[PDB]
Symmetry: C4
Subunit: 470 residues, 4 copies
């Protein structure tokens, strides 16, 4: 009877922990936030670059389109008629910033055959090929290289390369007329030319109705082959924490969560000190360790982020400067990811107390007894899966977007297995190998290989049911 | 022999009942009705707001677009050249009505940090923060709050909030010139401003060729974050019933259905009294009780709806007023839902007489024998399903429309399992966690977990067949 | 040895027959024909109604759009600059024809409540409500009713109704200027009004390069609820057969096919005369009877169609008339359908000689021994399938296009099972019952019920393999 | 121990070989190449033909659109302001070339019935119907036929026909003004008329930043039924190889790969000389032979291609000519295809050393024992699959794009099985047979026939596990 009562006590404690965690994670969420970013992104990406034009920021194709956007839709969205409100609600915080990364002329070598017709070549962006010399009129921060440290920047993982936080930057103005003049001055002096490899536009807004910031980042990359590759980022933040009663309730819930985390840390360490050799012999102990580690990491990230609020205080002293909220947004994204993973893994631990009756124990035994063969056939299946992915990358890699990178081929093959196919592009890219690849993949994966998993599961379930009937 | 004859008599009676119910439910449906609403919705939602503009009602983005629609496409669709026929057949009944819901300034608290730059804040719509004071010129019903009781209104479940039936309303006119003047007067005095949270446009039409009304409701919501969220509703009604011979035939069928339902009620009550100890132990008795309860609820709703025809009589006395058919449309929708569910559950009861031979009995035994294990593994499977849904909500909640609400995540995961995927948006929202979530979900759900249902069914079928073979 | 050699002889004869049939059916096909209709349909449907307008023929919405098409894109497509070639290759044969079907005023009864505001009502199209009296100026065939017999017409199965071959028709002219004048005269006198229920535009072209006709039919329906429902039909024909060497080769193949069919008829009749009582005890005999009946029907249709070449001869005598090729196109479509079905069923008969070794016999025994239970569970599964379809029709019937008709619901549910879903529209139509219907359908159909077929097949295969190992 | 250590040595050697091959195949790929072709194709295809027009090169519909493209978007893309750079990076090499294929008047025979109205007919393109006589002004190479040998051309496999390398060609100029004059002169003299059957536009560019050429080919076909069928081809080439350090590293890797291939060839020949009769009894020996043959073919193609760099040398002597890189592009495509297949098959051989423990051996034995029955049921299943495909071709062949060719039907049926359906077009093409075909195909294939594969696999797995358990 002691075992059942102890299990019930553990179940009740874990249920309380689960309710606390769910309350926290839904308190840090709301429907108000999705439409915030939806309207912001629509305004800044979906609006045509100009009345006559049709291309938006989403469909930029050249430097001329980027200049039209910068002098056009961007200024329309940013400034609303001394203080701007991106809508009638969202105040524009301070000043926007524009930054570019540059590459040296001669960072690549032209073949000796063509040196008579081609004199200048610019390599793809890299830390080695980066340009750090003044150009243009050399008047101000837009024409002089500023290091990452002096710019208080950080690296950004772009579509085709990873970019540093340094470059040539200009701080725009509070009003539309001044910003337009600055942008026109930049364009006249040819700010963007052959050496440009990336450009960033950063600005943040604040919504007092719901007490949420929004950090915006627009990146346009200029590959060595010509054209542009636009991208965007809209990240809401809650820098100010305690403004309402629900905020204090969530603070209390967070304190309770920290108490629970410390209690679990102590409990797990106590058992580790005795069973350390065989502690990882059970999956539940590994799950408990993962949960506690993730929760501790989340707590540490939260503590670090809460002390970074001093950047907001610096901005509030003088509002004519650029508010650097990129680090806060990055750490908020990291915290959200870690909290989501912790919640997911806390949910999975519910299987520990799910053996109510003989049926649940039957199913759990079937699933545990089936893992050894499932892993082996997973290796076997994924060998062929990766062979097919490599063939697809080598065949359609340069033509089809779905196969443009070795990682994207895996996702495309998963989608094809599910039923989300784009066979027209595959057939267009290669009229002989495209159809052969598609047909053979579909056959040997959907029709045959996918059924080995189910055969293993079926045999294991039947064996377990026959055995446990005793 | 008595058992077989009694079962045959029951089967014949139930076949007659099913035929009557199907006749009723298909008589209350026609192909003419779908194209009615199709043309109405194409006229009002799909037409461009103006000749130069591209945005329609479906794609409104701001208060300016809403004003352009109200002064533009709405008047074009409403008035066709004293009486308006909306294509050439649908008489416009009475006048339309426009109603807005409002919020008080100061219903939220600004953080003390930003009180020097922001003075006014309006909270999200709620009954507590609702505004009930006059504004603007204070001339008429458009500038004074009218309660739900005095407005004969009712609540509406919107996209982002549930709204009351009160607010500030104006009754438009019969002709285009008067309505345009009223709308221009509203716009000049700034009817919509920071405090607006919702707006409604209501009107109904009548088609004499097919004898059907159409109650229309256009709702535009104004979130606290800016922008607009349009929505619509086109609900045909049949207030006048006995016109043609088929209508009298359907009335006779309804009388027969009522007699059948009374007979079944008496039979079920007698069986409950006789076999109180075994009634709820059988699934068929539960199905019979569900069917009888749903049919009684449908009959009650129908009786209430017929007594509600008095609203049409009030309108017919004076045609210069607004016909309030919202309640009739709501109850028609409820009746349709109840009747559809009753039909569905009446169809399922055919399984009672489906045991013709050994094959059908074996199949039914197999289905009823694995229900115990199917429910347990359904619990086990849906624990992981909801864990994945919660992770998806916490990760893509603020970026992807498909995961914008906790309920939307479940439907999106069902669609992903089927094969309807939107992986591009998932990868765009999170380039690391998006692919991991998608790949792990697909693997652990489609490839492995979904096959446990199949293993259970296969093992149970084999066991049942082996047992019943002897 | 006797059985093996007789089977070998039968297999050789049937392989020759199959080769002949495949040769015929692929000789009556060519890639040249798909692009013929593709260009015709792109020219007539896809092109905008006018330079300023955006609506196509596919997106007509009112009588004004239809008039603009008739005076606009239609004349541009028809006439190319006495003889017109709809492209630089396809001669326009004779003149086009326009025909409308009409309904009487007062074919429905207005409710007594509204008789003071509505005086005229036109019912949906039917043979009883059809109008047969002159209207308008009463000058010519466009304003007088012409019966189906005198018009040499036939019924057409439209989208919302089935239409007769009678009505009010006008024969257009050979040149653009005359046709435009006729259409303008029709429009000025108000040819289309409240009574119109359908309109037809018929014309045919000839392409001498590939020796193919193309019979075109554009139908626009005018429901009693307003609006228009466009539809089209492009049917290539081969009236002139024996021109090239391949045509004579195909004639020889057709003669060989008739000889084979007579031989098979004689064989089957001889077998029936001996085993008439138990002849239908075998599936292969039923397949043979089906094949022979379908082939005889195809031969009869071909003989009827060849005699119907006299219509072309009548047209060729005077080219200033309307070539009535509608019957030839209808019979060509019927012949193509019957030939396709015959080819499909001839392919299936290849299973008779597929028992090469023990593996094929094992699989055939498994499939035949499984049909008894597969049919029973098919009935069981389709009862629930039809219950769900009826619920979907009653719930989303008036809002969603995919559920607009009772037959559309079945196809939509099949598509949903496969993975082709449109959940957004379902959720929009009903925000409570939509999600419930979708989720419950997906669960109980894909997760559970679809696996009973698979369990039955697996058990039968295992039993057959265990038995035949003896 | 004797077997295990030899297997370990073989595994290590094959792992080294696999790493070398993967290094080579990923060194011949880069993300920079996908966006190269992406920008090129967006510039030339997606760009509107003119400011007023909407048709692209992808949506050409007639000779007028082709002329507008040639005088419009093509010249805008080609020439950027003596030397042109398609972007600010990609130099235009030499001059473009325009070529056309032609057919004789009278290559077909008109029926005697219509010879009084039609005088000229042009057959579909073929080597027999090809025209080879001068036309037009007869001034220069654009109006005289040049054979394939004298044009240094080669055949091209188009959408509706295979085309020779001969025809009437004009070499365009280096500057926009001269090319526009030449194109206008061609258009004025009616270069394209009834006899035209195909047109090609060829040009290549070079990117010094990434050292990659791009051979471009735009083909517009003119069917005998009218209209145009555009198509395109963008193929990057690495003609110049030894420039950077990574290039020398890849050369060393290629030398190592050649040594490995020679060693494997010797090893396999040694075993063949001994096991001549039973060498093919093992699947692994067949895989080794396939790998060796494919690698040798790839090496031969590479040797042929490297010695073919002389074409670039000829062009570099005089840059005022047309650079004929078509053969180099063709052979690069062939080499890429063969290398991809070799990589795929090299990956599959990893299964030989995958028998680590009892689980992997059991899975491999299950897969091996299945092949006998799986092949038989594959024949059985594909008989019905091809019957359905033939029926679909005969029914929807002339109406639906997905069924336009007998090969397209197979791919469309695979897609339908997966879940990628276009049921709307199928139902539109045939309203009776379309739904029947779709429903019966889905049922008999997805619900029933696809489960026999799984039944076989499951039964074999259970048998193998029971046998090997003891
Ligand atoms: Ca699927």
């Amino acid at each position: 009877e002691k075992y059942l009562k102890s299990v019930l006590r553990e179940l009740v404690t874990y249920l309380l922990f689960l309710i606390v965690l769910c309350i926290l994670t839904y308190g840090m969420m709301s429907s108000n936030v999705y439409y915030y970013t939806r309207m912001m992104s629509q305004l800044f990406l979906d609006t045509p670059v100009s009345k006559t034009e049709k291309t938006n920021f989403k469909t930029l194709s050249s430097m001329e389109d980027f200049w039209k956007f910068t002098e056009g839709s961007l200024l329309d969205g940013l400034y609303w008629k001394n203080r701007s409100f991106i809508f009638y609600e969202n105040l524009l915080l301070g000043v926007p910033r524009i930054r570019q990364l540059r590459v040296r002329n001669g960072s690549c070598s032209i073949p000796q055959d063509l040196r008579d017709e081609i004199k200048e070549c610019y390599d793809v962006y890299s830390v080695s090929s980066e340009d750090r010399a003044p150009f243009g009129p050399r008047n101000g921060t837009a024409w002089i290289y500023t290091s990452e440290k002096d710019l208080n920047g950080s690296s950004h993982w772009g579509i085709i390369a990873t970019y540093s936080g340094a470059g040539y930057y200009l701080d725009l103005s509070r009003t539309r007329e001044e910003t337009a003049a600055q942008v026109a001055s930049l364009k006249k002096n040819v700010w963007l030319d052959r050496g440009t490899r990336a450009t960033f536009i950063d600005f943040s807004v604040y919504n007092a109705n719901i007490n949420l910031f929004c950090v915006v980042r627009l990146l346009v990359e200029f590959p060595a082959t010509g054209g542009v590759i636009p991208s965007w980022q809209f990240q809401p933040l809650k820098l100010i924490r305690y403004v309402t009663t629900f905020d204090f309730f969530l603070a209390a819930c967070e304190i309770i969560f920290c108490f629970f985390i410390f209690y679990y840390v102590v409990e797990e360490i106590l058992e580790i000190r005795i069973h350390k050799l065989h502690y990882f012999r059970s999956f539940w102990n590994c799950l408990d360790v993962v949960i506690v580690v993730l929760s501790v990491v989340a707590i540490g990230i939260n503590i670090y982020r809460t002390s970074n609020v001093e950047v907001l205080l610096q901005f509030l002293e003088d509002q004519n400067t650029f508010p650097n909220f990129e680090h806060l947004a990055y750490w908020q994204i990291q915290f959200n990811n870690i909290a989501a993973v912790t919640v997911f893994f806390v949910w999975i631990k519910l299987f520990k107390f799910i053996n109510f009756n003989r049926t649940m124990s039957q199913l759990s035994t079937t699933m545990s007894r089936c893992a050894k063969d499932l892993f082996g056939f997973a290796i076997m299946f994924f060998i062929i899966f990766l062979a097919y992915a490599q063939l697809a990358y080598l065949v359609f890699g340069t033509q089809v977007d779905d196969f443009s990178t070795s990682q994207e081929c895996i996702f495309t093959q998963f989608r094809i297995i599910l039923g989300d196919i784009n066979f027209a592009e595959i057939e267009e890219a290669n009229r002989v190998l495209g159809p052969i690849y598609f047909t053979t993949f579909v056959f040997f994966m959907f029709f045959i290989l996918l059924n080995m998993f189910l055969a293993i599961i079926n045999d294991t379930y039947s064996e377990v049911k026959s055995d446990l009937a005793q």
